[PDB]
Symmetry: C5
Subunit: 258 residues, 5 copies
């Protein structure tokens, strides 16, 4: 049972941070990029290396210690950080045509963020159930052909960074009562990125009963994916490029019973 909101100067706080992307980082110079994408000969032989698989980013942020009172997340400001970096079309890129500039980052993107009072809850779904996922990732276990559409065995929490591959996992809509999530997959082999920034846009996190995420143990959970597309180098090889995401969350003290 959720009771009244506490008022007074002491009763509000603000969390501000950036989540870095976890795209695979194939060497010591390539933070923010995946390994070049290679293609299996068959579905049966699909076995991507770890450094080729973008993962969900997650941060657990401690809040001022309370105590029952709980911090309630009320509003969010968020945007992708470094959108202009994608204007570097002069660095080992495959040219658009002879003498032209380098191709920009483009193609499949996934832009996702969530705010919750506990870890984001995940459901596994596989493009191909016979994919061998690599050591160091957490992926759907006991995959069957049903895993290609819905196998309810594949439940997890986003409770580790650099671990849950984006392609295996989505927010579980049957759970996440204490999280608000938002995402868009834009597919297509060379779809153009469209990235907006502004410090004037706010998302309200309150449900239809006027209640936002309530932070269990005085911890706020922030999650993101910002796969912007693929970068094409001069050989034609392509690799995922991600960007960091900014979060500002405003919270207020809420009394609750039981």
């Amino acid at each position: 049972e959720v009771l009244e909101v506490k008022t007074g100067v002491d009763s509000i706080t603000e969390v501000e941070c950036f989540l870095t992307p976890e795209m695979g980082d194939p060497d010591e110079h390539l933070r923010g990029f995946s390994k070049s994408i290679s293609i299996s000969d068959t579905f049966e032989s699909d076995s991507p290396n770890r450094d080729m698989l973008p993962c969900y980013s997650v941060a657990r942020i401690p809040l001022p210690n309370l105590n029952i009172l709980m911090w309630e997340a009320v509003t969010l400001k968020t945007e992708v950080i470094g959108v202009t970096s994608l204007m570097n079309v002069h660095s080992n890129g495959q040219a658009t045509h002879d003498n032209g500039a380098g191709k920009p980052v483009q193609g499949t993107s996934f832009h996702f963020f969530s705010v919750g009072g506990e870890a984001l809850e995940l459901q596994g779904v596989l493009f191909n159930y016979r994919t061998k996922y690599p050591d160091g990732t957490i992926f759907p276990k006991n995959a069957t052909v049903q895993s290609q559409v819905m196998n309810t065995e594949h439940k997890a929490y986003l409770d580790k960074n650099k671990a849950y591959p984006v392609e295996c996992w989505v927010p579980d809509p049957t759970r996440n009562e204490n999280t608000r999530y938002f995402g868009t997959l834009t597919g297509g082999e060379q779809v153009p990125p469209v990235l907006h920034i502004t410090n004037t846009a706010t998302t309200v996190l309150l449900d239809e009963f006027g209640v936002g995420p309530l932070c269990k143990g005085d911890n706020l959970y922030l999650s993101a994916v910002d796969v912007c597309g693929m970068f094409t180098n001069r050989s034609g090889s392509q690799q995922w490029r991600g960007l960091s995401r900014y979060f500002k969350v405003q919270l207020r003290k809420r009394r609750v019973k039981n």
Copy 2:
């Protein structure tokens, strides 16, 4: 039916939560969620698609708590496509974008559709080509004539069976469906990019202009869906439909009627 007052009290409401898996053709035991590779007839007259090359409408009849005159009234819907991120597998037997590039993602013609009603969805048959010979095990427009390519009012059916009603033959009958709410988008084009949004913050109200939602005949709720996301292109250039499951959560309340 004269519709009267809504019942109140803790026990006056119930909730249905459910996922509908796609029915894309499933051409072998490893390919749930996909169709058979598409092949093209040399003439309109010789068009004879095999069953496993034809996506069909998904449907579920959900029994509700027994009432009797009270009827369960569907008031709100939350819904979304499950597994959107699986379309980021561009390393599994796909045709490369170009020399050394990543695999092409699922793209091209999509149909995204869902409906909620208190009885089976009512269908009207329309055929691209009236001479198409539909296969055994499908339910299709019978006694087709050349008028069936635009409108033949003989072709009426109920979506009353799973893996049966091919998507390309049937649409919701706008002359009926008074006790169902339906929503769908066909986005065509040989390589249109998929755009799939997920969030747990969106709700659709199913009440009509008079404040009445679908009323469940025999305490049965009917959910229907199609989510053809596009086509996957394998290394040989062959293309097959790929579909994804759909989540439904519906809130219902008891309503007295005559």
Copy 3:
């Protein structure tokens, strides 16, 4: 006419429900809903399209219950393109997207148009090329001059016959049509993808800024439509227009006038 009060009571309203079939040219007995393959003239002066290569406006005059004064007033419209899923037939004599690929779907230039009025839709002629020779059996701008390529006020007509008024020759006349509500979108481009939405939950209100809808002269309602969805490309590369039927449901009420 001075428009006075709306009549009330159970008898004061009526409903019109119907479908208008497309008139795309119907080049043979198997190709209802298609045009003849498009041929290209060598010069502007030699452009002489055959009748079966020219989509035309559809129109229906629906008689209403006899009233006499009182007039039937059109208040709301539900409308929908019927058979949108038929465009997923990419296996019937289409040109392949690439070697071993599925057939290309209908795509390219579309015109989607509908109007509701109390009299025939008023048309203004505008010609792409004033030297086009239009075929016997069609009604087209007469005495064309070079000014007909931009605006020649001699070209006035009424949409008063089916299978007759070519889409490419005529538009709604914005200088007239006070007693009609019309809505249209031309989406050009050689392969723009169709985007077709269906739902039974959308209504368009036909009342003007003074709260008055179309008033039906002689107790006749006029419905008009074009739904050229794009072009179908067959195995040879030849292209032909494909159209679909449009559903209409109009609510009308009795209105006194003087």
Copy 4:
């Protein structure tokens, strides 16, 4: 200077209704609505476009009923491009999409613009290339310098003559035009599809934030437009601009001023 009350009574309102034809260059007696085929200079220094290759702004000065202090205040606008369906002529000396295909439609760069004011539209010159030699018979930015490629405040003009002001070197001057309302969209790209909407149900309000419309000096209303729809490609591959006429309906009321 000082705006006082609006007049009322049956006599206090008037309406202006007209169309502006496009001025695309009209390269011969058969090609009203089209420009000359577009050629490309070898260098910026040699850019010397023909008069008939340059589309121009259209303008109409419309005398209003004599008033005298009272002034006509323009309050609402309805506007529409006339002849949108003419772009469905893909059978008249067009370059085929591919072998045996239909002709390509008009597509590529478009500029759609309209304004309503109580005096001539005020213009600011901006040049793509300051060394362009603009031809005899056009009115263009004089004493051009390299700064004219970004902003040269010397280039001020009034849109006070037809077939004179090339579209490509003039825009509405945002530093002036207090007594005009203007609206325009440049949609660029080598083959972007045209999207043209028509309806007689849409009104634009011309009142500013103080509820004051353009005030017609000397009882003249000024209407201006450009509707370059894209380029038409003939069989040789050569391209020329295609424009259409624009309809205006403006409602005005008498306003007292001191």
Copy 5:
């Protein structure tokens, strides 16, 4: 500062009107508004763009009528890109769309950005490739590391000099800029079509959720912009950035503040 009442009366309001020119690199005396043709490095480690190949942020600091505590408060903005129609010049040393066709227009990657603030726009550095050698005459993220490719909080700056801060290195810092309102859109893709709207009827309100707009420290208003419209392709296939100027009209009112 406590924000108190707005002052009223005929002299309590003022207006600022100006245009910011684009700073795209200006590679010779005839190419104001354009960058140098884009060249591509062989490897990430050899990326070394010349200054005239790098578009930069534009900024203007405008002095306001001297006050005095009262501060000018920015309330509304009208803005638009100036010269949108110039992009219809497809007849001047462009690569043809196809044989005998017209010249390709400006297209591909665009960044359209503007901000209004009562102090310099605050910037955060992010690099596509941390080994890029940025040229003399530009102000760029210093002591770059591989972390700079995603987030290195050392890269803080103020947009306080024109023709200096390269667009590709810098973005508005969302952790600061309390006294600025900023808006931008990056539209990527190798040949995305520009869509540019002009009108004198659109206004943006600069007030925050508490009804307070940017407060002008020292009676100065800061305006910033980028309008990289895309790339022009010349007959050889070489591509270069093309930018346009941006108009700003800002309405301000006098606001009393404490301490």
